[PDB]
């Protein structure tokens, strides 16, 4: 739990948008990631501070299909320690993953989702979505944005669920290539 513990403290923040409470992973410097349906926009609340969003990029694939990820550049002096090195180069499943959740309503919470498998296509609330992975755990509302970790790796971001299963958007280190 050392990794998940250090990642929560250094990198994972309680967040609010117009869509409600979400978990947010700071990736490096002022770059952070959120589930697309959180619709950050121009501003978000990070730990009850109203922050300006300088940039928001919604990840889609070459065909323009939703990946349910939104990269945000925050207007803050605070820098996140670089965790891109814990993000695998290709979207990979895992064994015994821990879903890390951190919102005002569900603070500092570890969820034993278990195995994480390649899933692919998912119709998330009527929206076609690609590159998703799945875990057989009854995830619930308010857990979106949750960080899926396994053996020192950050493999996904929780985005949805169907009652008995949880889904995350796969994480590639390539998403975070510098400019």
């Amino acid at each position: 739990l050392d990794f998940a513990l250090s990642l929560l403290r250094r990198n994972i923040r309680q967040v609010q948008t117009d869509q409600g409470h979400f978990t947010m992973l700071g990736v490096r410097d002022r770059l952070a990631i959120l589930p697309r349906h959180s619709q950050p926009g121009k501003t978000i609340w990070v730990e009850h501070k109203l922050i300006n969003v300088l940039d928001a990029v919604e990840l889609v694939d070459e065909q323009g299909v939703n990946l349910e990820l939104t990269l945000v550049t925050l207007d803050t002096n605070e820098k996140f320690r670089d965790v891109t090195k814990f993000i695998p180069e290709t979207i990979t499943g895992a064994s015994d993953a821990t879903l890390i959740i951190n919102t005002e309503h569900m603070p500092s919470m570890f969820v034993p989702v278990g195995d994480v498998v390649q899933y692919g296509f998912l119709n998330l609330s009527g929206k076609p979505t690609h590159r998703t992975m799945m875990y057989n755990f009854p995830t619930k509302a308010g857990q979106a944005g949750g960080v899926v970790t396994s053996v020192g790796k950050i493999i996904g971001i929780h985005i949805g669920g169907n009652g008995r299963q949880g889904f995350c958007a796969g994480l590639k280190r390539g998403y975070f290539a510098s400019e």
Binding site: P35, Q143, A144, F167
Partner: peptide, 8 residues
């Protein structure tokens, strides 16, 4: 009715 889920 497969491959379905809702945002959470």
């Amino acid at each position: 009715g497969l491959r379905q889920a809702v945002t959470q």
